[PDB]
Design a protein around this ligand. Structure first.
Ligand code: CHL
Ligand code: CHL
Ligand code: CLA
Ligand code: CLA
Ligand code: CLA
Ligand code: CLA
Ligand code: CLA
Ligand code: CLA
Ligand SMILES: CC1=C[C@H](O)CC(C)(C)[C@H]1/C=C/C(C)=C/C=C/C(C)=C/C=C/C=C(C)/C=C/C=C(C)/C=C/C1=C(C)C[C@H](O)CC1(C)C
Ligand SMILES: CC1=C[C@H](O)CC(C)(C)[C@H]1/C=C/C(C)=C/C=C/C(C)=C/C=C/C=C(C)/C=C/C=C(C)/C=C/C1=C(C)C[C@H](O)CC1(C)C
Lengths: 165, 212, 203, 229, 39, 217
């Protein structure tokens, strides 16, 4: 497929690694009783192992010459060959939650600078104001591009600089 | 002057005796703020009214269950109602959360704004969802027989009786739960077992409550 | 003043100026006077088409039970020949009713503006316009002697009764699956075993 | 002014104005006047239905024996269908009840006959219409109202006694009275059931189970059977 | 009680509560959804 | 006034004379997205466009979907209609999408520049003869001229009612289309089939029983 990588459902070293991990787990299993708690724990481990290999072969992952899932990081190649759920959807999910955190922190800072004790609100957190901004920060990309388009996202050159600027 | 939960100690400053059931019992000082005490008064009333309602359900169902009427015991009643009728469990759960969330959200935003649910926005109703006190929403619906507006001293007596029976039913429901967790039986079965041998069938014979 | 429920409080915008003003508006649908104008005209139109509909369902079935080209039920009227397909008749119906309907609507928008015959420019309705109540050639037999009021109220009562009757015919025919005069014959044969509750619980 | 307990004091909202007022309100249910109007009307209506019911059960047992009045809805026969009788009762009672309720909520607003514009019922108090409802009166209203509420309270107690004596013994009121006249020491409610902290015994319900009507199997339970003895 | 909630409003206490909430939320997600690599 | 929650406080930006007179104002901005009035103007426009195309789309779902359960109009499902239509068509879907991108881009850019300046598309010379009828009607989002042929916008006393009926039917059609999407993924049948299944057994066929929407039960 991409870069000479076989799919994991077609790869043989993938099945070999699955069989090898099941073999290690059953070699650890065969020295206990039938209905004992280590036996139940190792059977749950084997169940999760089989379910994980079935889920990785189900999702269309690409395996290499060693039988391990490889990820594709190019928007067009992954959207073309159906690999968008491994980098592209995760990178926009991360940018949503990271900009969430940053926008809530920025709104807390601008909310506490307008008082007689900004540092005292920085040490001891105003919990109702923090929860209010935490719930209101779900529309952070819209509010971010609106603050970008008004010129209120940036401070002007009233910033602190050195004598050679 | 007034009877305190612990004779000899004075009551705290935030508990004056204006509240129903005000015995000065706040050793952890959970209600020093008046708004937090207001919220806890309403939470106490809601827990108490649910415990009275549920405890009367426990007692009536157990009376009907010991005598051979076919009633289940209360730890089996939900399973045998869902299985006897053709009721699916999650749809009845979601319908319960729908109706209860409607009513409880009305109560919530009437705590937040203390007269606001009688603006006529709900269907046409006005002053029938206006409250009277914190946790005392008597109008035409919630007080249809009209006892909160005549003989106000008798209404304070009913407030005292309501808080006392509610605390008694809360410790009764905790009793049913812990009682079944130890004995594994219905509660009036345990009452009959205590009436059989009082000196020998009690919590000092289970092996659970005192494991010595 | 007659109420739909004696002793009840009546809405203030209902004042007897309309025919059949009994104060019945529990959902407060006509607080706007403009909406009340539209609803009065729509009540007249739905009522008069319902009166013609209930006559056209009664009288052929009332004549088919006694001693004429077809004795077919009203809901099976589409599956009959009528010298032509129903589509061409639909087209003729929509053209001629587009003409008549748009002329009536232009009367309702501007009263006193749709009165005279456009081809034969001397034929004309008189100046007593009253949107919804044309007159002239629409009253050819010399009525409205008893002034206008009692006949308007009879008109709206027979019309509301026929609207309820047509909602009847649709419901009764959808439930019982049969013709309405045969349903009346079954109610007259044994009313105590043929109610709505009996036929509902018979399912 | 006689009282329910001679010697005590009536509640402050019970002056003695209404008929049958003997100062009996321990729960304080009549301290609201707007409630007390509704409860006076409801007391009169319950009392009149219960008087007519007790007279119906007594005349029904005297005139037509071997018909247990608790089985009157079951073993009646008529070419009148059950749903047709229930429909006639529904529409006619909905009519009468809504007329009376409109007189309640609007005092004196349904006095006039709707069909005939001649006949208007005279002005009155709520609960006591008069006119065609009272063509003949023996004596004065100020004593007959007291007689009416006394006979009515007594007949309400009589009807719940009929229901309990029918669910416990399975016999009519005259038959159960002859049972109590045969063995008075042995046929009482104390003589049939007892609860002691050892054990509890209750009478068996003489009404068996869900009663089979015409293919519907009406459930027929006995009133609060777990809390009986 | 006001001072106890002010102390609970301090920075290391809130950082402890919030990281306990965040770590517990991630732990419950990785329990009920074992081993997510894609989607 | 009317609110989405009786008792909650209305935000201060939705309680202004410029916001109270818009259409369908119920004080519903818990995320505070409309605090900037330029942003609230832009979001009014986006709401009107989503309302109108959601109504037109949901009508194209329902009326062919209701009439296909009646006699005429053998119409496929909306999640299958594009494939049957492109089998019956004359062009491939990419060419048709390119044509609709040019045709929609022209119109949308007209509306874009009319948002950026209200008195914009009434330049003389800019259009052959449609330049004088491509202005607004003093309220942006509500154009006149060739748009609105029947002249119903002319009457002033019905006008807030027409606006508020439009915004209520539009918000409701947006919920309808999002329900079409979710119902399509959870069940795999059509929306009229979902309505027939909820009418046949309501207490057993709903989203607590589909096994998708809340999988902890
Ligand atoms: C406005 C009043 C009106 C009412 C209540 C009906 C009602 C009916 N017509 Mg209809 N029609 C009406 C106006 C008209 N019909 C017709 C011409 C027909 C025909 C030719 C037929 C009907 C039929 C029907 C049935 C439609 C059931 C169905 O599944 O359709 C779904 C199918 C289609 C829409 C096609 C139902 C009895 C059918 C019938 O009678 O079968 C029992 C039928 O064959 N109608 C014309 C002439 C254009 C009308 C004029 O406005
Ligand atoms: C409102 C006054 C009223 C009272 C106190 C009774 C009381 C009775 N009905 Mg009767 N009925 C009454 C009105 C009517 N009944 C009937 C027709 C019947 C039938 C066919 C039967 C009874 C039966 C009974 C008996 C037991 C029913 C039961 O256990 O309830 C449980 C059932 C319900 C509570 C259903 C809900 C009804 C709703 C609350 C009113 C008991 C004597 C049954 C009987 O005699 O068997 C021993 C019986 O089979 N009734 C009709 C229709 C004409 C009535 C309308 O006025
Ligand atoms: C971080 C830098 C970066 C690099 C080095 C690549 C590299 C590649 N891209 Mg990717 N891509 C990227 C980021 C990048 N991408 C970003 C940010 C986007 C969103 C705008 C895309 C969206 C995208 C699409 C839609 C496609 C690619 C494709 C490709 C491959 C060939 C492209 C080419 O020949 O043009 C020279 C490379 C560049 C100018 C680097 C920038 C890439 C731009 C954004 C897209 C170029 C697409 C190209 C014109 C289409 C070629 C068609 C192909 C059949 C020959 C190549 C592996 C194509 C592919 O799938 O090939 C198999 C393809 O169709 N990319
Ligand atoms: C049993 C003790 C008890 C007492 C003394 C009260 C007393 C009061 N209630 Mg409370 N209430 C109770 C239980 C009780 N309640 C329970 C269990 C619930 C949950 C259902 C409530 C839910 C409730 C609401 C929603 C409201 C009240 C209100 C009131 C006040 C006026 C109404 C009244 O006087 O009724 C007097 C109470 C009795 C005579 C108790 C009757 C006990 C029955 C007969 C037991 C048998 C039935 C049972 C199912 C078995 C008064 C302080 C109203 C208020 O505060 O208005 C300002 C009001 O709006 N209560
Ligand atoms: C559908 C035709 C129709 C229309 C347009 C009207 C319109 C009107 N009626 Mg009439 N009415 C009707 C049918 C209609 N009615 C029928 C069938 C009856 C017998 C039950 C009546 C009995 C009646 C009485 C006694 C009175 C009126 C009155 C009115 C006027 C004010 C009430 C209002 O604002 O509601 C506007 C109505 C609508 C917007 C129609 C709603 C249609 C619903 C949605 C259908 C629901 C299904 C249905 C229940 C089956 C208004 C002109 C009052 C008046 O002043 O008379 C002139 C009055 O006193 N109506
Ligand atoms: C049956 C109820 C009824 C009543 C009491 C009225 C009453 C009235 N109509 Mg109305 N009308 C009706 C039904 C009725 N109409 C129907 C069903 C239609 C649709 C065709 C109309 C369409 C209509 C128009 C276009 C006009 C009137 C006008 C009038 C007013 C004067 C004319 C007159 O007195 O005729 C009295 C009605 C009768 C005596 C009914 C006769 C019954 C016939 C003969 C039965 C037909 C055969 C049957 C199907 C079998 C009067 C208020 C006129 C007006 O208001 O001018 C100022 C006017 O221009 N009506
Ligand atoms: C219709 C099916 C049905 C059946 C077979 C039963 C059967 C029983 N009920 Mg129950 N009950 C029912 C419905 C039913 N109930 C409903 C709908 C309610 C709420 C009003 C109750 C309220 C109720 C109470 C408070 C008690 C019982 C009790 C009992 C048991 C003893 C008989 C009795 O006391 O009469 C039934 C009691 C009544 C007060 C009569 C109401 C029952 C009728 C049939 C309701 C019909 C209404 C419906 C909408 C039509 C018996 C197993 C007793 C028991 O032992 O519980 C532990 C008891 O204390 N029932
Ligand atoms: C910084 C680089 C990095 C990256 C990209 C990852 C990424 C991942 N790790 Mg790894 N890991 C890392 C560093 C990293 N880790 C480090 C430093 C350690 C040692 C502490 C580990 C030790 C570790 C273990 C033991 C495990 C992982 C697992 C994972 C997977 C977790 C997916 C998940 O949490 O469910 C989804 C998360 C959510 C749904 C929470 C987000 C909530 C928002 C609201 C969702 C919004 C979405 C739109 C993910 C691929 C798990 C795995 O199985 O890998 C295959 C796993 O068991 N990691
Ligand atoms: C005051 C104070 C103060 C200071 O500061 C501190 C301190 C001391 C800490 C505090 C104290 C506290 C306490 C004691 C608490 C307790 C509580 C409770 C117990 C509750 C319950 C509560 C309880 C409750 C609600 C309950 C309820 C119940 C119910 C509903 C039931 C139900 C049911 C029934 C019927 C039957 C069926 O079959 C089943 C069921 C479902 C099971
Ligand atoms: C307000 C606010 C504010 C605050 O601040 C916050 C918050 C809350 C967040 C917010 C909210 C929001 C929301 C809810 C939103 C939603 C939206 C939507 C749903 C849309 C849709 C929307 C929708 C839409 C457009 C749609 C449309 C549709 C269409 C066209 C369709 C089409 C079609 C058809 C016909 C058929 C064929 O076969 C195919 C197709 C092609 C498919």
């Amino acid at each position: 497929d991409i870069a000479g990588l076989t799919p994991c459902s077609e790869s043989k070293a993938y099945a070999k690694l699955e069989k090898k991990e099941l073999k290690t787990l059953e070699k650890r299993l065969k020295q206990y009783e039938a209905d004992s708690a280590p036996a139940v724990a190792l059977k749950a481990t084997m169940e999760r192992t089989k379910a994980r290999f079935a889920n990785y072969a189900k999702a269309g992952l690409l395996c290499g010459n060693d039988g391990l899932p490889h990820l594709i990081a190019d928007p067009g190649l992954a959207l073309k060959y159906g690999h968008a759920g491994e980098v592209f959807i995760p990178t926009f999910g991360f940018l949503y939650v990271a900009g969430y955190i940053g926008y809530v922190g920025r709104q807390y800072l601008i909310a506490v600078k307008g008082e007689a004790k900004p540092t005292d609100k920085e040490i001891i957190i105003d919990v109702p104001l923090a929860t209010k901004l935490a719930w209101q920060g779900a529309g952070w990309p819209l509010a971010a591009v609106q603050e970008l388009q008004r010129g209120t996202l940036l401070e002007k050159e009233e910033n602190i600089t050195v004598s050679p600027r | 002057v007034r009877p305190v939960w612990f004779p000899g100690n004075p009551p705290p400053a935030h508990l004056d005796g204006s509240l129903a059931g005000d015995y000065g019992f706040d050793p952890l000082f959970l209600g020093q703020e008046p708004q937090t005490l207001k919220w806890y008064v309403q939470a106490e009333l809601v827990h108490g009214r649910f415990a009275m309602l549920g405890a009367a359900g426990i007692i009536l169902t157990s009376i009907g269950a010991k005598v051979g009427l076919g009633f289940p015991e209360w730890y089996d009643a939900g399973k045998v109602v869902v299985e006897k009728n053709n009721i699916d469990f999650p749809t009845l759960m979601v319908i319960q959360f729908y109706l209860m969330g409607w009513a409880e959200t009305k109560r919530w935003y009437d705590f937040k704004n203390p007269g606001s649910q009688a603006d006529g926005s709900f269907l046409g109703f006005t002053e029938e969802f206006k409250g009277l006190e914190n946790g005392y929403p008597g109008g035409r619906f919630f007080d249809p027989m009209g006892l909160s507006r005549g003989d106000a001293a008798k209404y304070q007596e009913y407030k005292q009786k309501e808080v006392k029976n509610g605390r008694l039913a809360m410790i009764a429901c905790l009793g049913f739960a812990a009682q079944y967790a130890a004995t594994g039986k219905g509660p009036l079965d345990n009452l009959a077992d205590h009436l059989a041998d009082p000196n020998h069938v009690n919590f000092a014979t289970n092996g659970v409550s005192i494991p010595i | 003043l007659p109420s739909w429920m004696p002793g009840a409080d009546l809405p203030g915008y209902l004042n007897g100026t309309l025919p059949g003003d009994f104060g019945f508006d529990p959902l407060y649908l006509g607080q706007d006077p403009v909406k009340l104008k539209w609803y009065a005209q729509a009540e007249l139109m739905n009522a008069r088409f319902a009166m013609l509909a209930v006559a056209g369902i009664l009288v052929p079935e009332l004549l088919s039970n006694i001693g004429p080209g077809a004795g077919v039920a009203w809901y099976d009227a589409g599956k009959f020949e009528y010298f032509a397909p129903a589509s061409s008749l639909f087209g003729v119906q929509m053209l001629l009713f587009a003409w008549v309907e748009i002329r009536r609507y232009q009367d309702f928008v501007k009263p006193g503006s749709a009165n005279q015959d456009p081809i034969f420019t001397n034929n004309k309705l008189p100046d007593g316009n009253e949107p919804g109540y044309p007159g002239g050639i629409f009253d050819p037999f010399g009525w409205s002697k008893g002034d206008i009021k009692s006949l308007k109220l009879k008109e709206i009562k027979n019309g509301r009764l026929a609207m309820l009757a047509f909602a009847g015919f649709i419901g009764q025919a959808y439930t019982t699956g049969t013709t309405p005069l045969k349903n009346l014959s079954t109610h007259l044969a044994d009313p105590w075993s043929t109610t709505v509750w009996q036929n509902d619980l018979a399912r | 002014r006689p009282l329910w307990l001679p010697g005590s004091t009536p509640p402050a909202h019970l002056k003695g104005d209404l008929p049958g007022d003997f100062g009996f309100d321990p729960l304080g249910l009549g301290a609201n006047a707007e409630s007390l109007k509704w409860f006076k009307e409801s007391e009169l209506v319950h009392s009149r239905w219960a008087m007519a019911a007790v007279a119906g059960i007594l005349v029904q047992e005297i005139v037509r024996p071997d018909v247990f009045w608790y089985n009157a809805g079951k073993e009646v026969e008529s070419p009148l269908g059950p749903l047709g009788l229930l429909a006639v009762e529904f529409f006619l009672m909905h009519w009468v009840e809504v007329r009376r309720w409109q007189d309640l909520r609007k005092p004196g607003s349904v006095d006039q006959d709707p069909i005939f514009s001649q006949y208007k019922l005279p002005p009155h108090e709520v609960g006591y219409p008069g006119g065609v409802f009272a063509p003949f009166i023996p004596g004065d209203l100020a004593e007959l109202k007291v007689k009416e509420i006394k006979n009515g309270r007594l007949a309400m107690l009589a009807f719940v006694g009929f229901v309990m004596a029918a669910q416990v013994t399975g016999k009519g009121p005259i038959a159960a009275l002859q049972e109590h006249l045969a063995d008075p020491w042995g046929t009482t409610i104390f003589s049939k059931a007892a609860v002691v902290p050892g054990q509890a015994v209750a009478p068996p319900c003489k009404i068996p189970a869900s009663v089979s009507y015409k293919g519907i199997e009406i459930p027929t339970p006995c009133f609060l059977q777990g809390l009986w003895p | 009680m006001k001072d106890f909630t002010t102390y609970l409003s301090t920075a290391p206490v809130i950082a402890t509560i919030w990281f306990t909430f965040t770590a517990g939320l991630l732990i419950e997600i990785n329990r009920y959804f074992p081993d997510p690599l894609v989607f | 006034r009317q609110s989405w929650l009786p008792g909650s406080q209305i935000p201060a930006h939705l309680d202004t004379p410029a916001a109270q007179a818009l259409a369908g104002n119920f004080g519903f901005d818990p995320l505070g997205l409309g605090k900037d009035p330029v942003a609230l103007r832009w979001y009014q426009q986006a709401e009107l466009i989503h309302c109108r195309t959601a109504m037109a789309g949901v009508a194209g779902i329902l009326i062919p979907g209701l009439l296909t359960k009646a006699g005429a109009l053998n119409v496929p499902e909306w999640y299958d209609a594009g494939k049957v239509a492109i089998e019956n068509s004359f062009a491939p879907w990419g060419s048709l999408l390119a044509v609709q991108l040019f045709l929609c881009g022209f119109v949308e850019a007209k509306r874009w520049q009319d948002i950026r300046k209200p008195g914009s598309q009434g330049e003389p010379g800019s259009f052959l003869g449609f330049e004088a009828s491509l202005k607004g009607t003093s309220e942006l989002g509500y154009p006149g001229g060739p748009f609105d042929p029947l002249g119903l916008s002319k009457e002033a006393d019905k006008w807030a009612d027409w606006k508020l009926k439009e915004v209520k039917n539009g918000r409701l059609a947006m919920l309808a289309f999002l329900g079409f999407v979710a119902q399509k993924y959870a069940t795999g049948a059509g929306p009229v089939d979902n309505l027939a299944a909820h009418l046949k057994d309501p207490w057993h066929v709903n989203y607590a029983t589909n096994g998708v929407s809340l999988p902890f039960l």
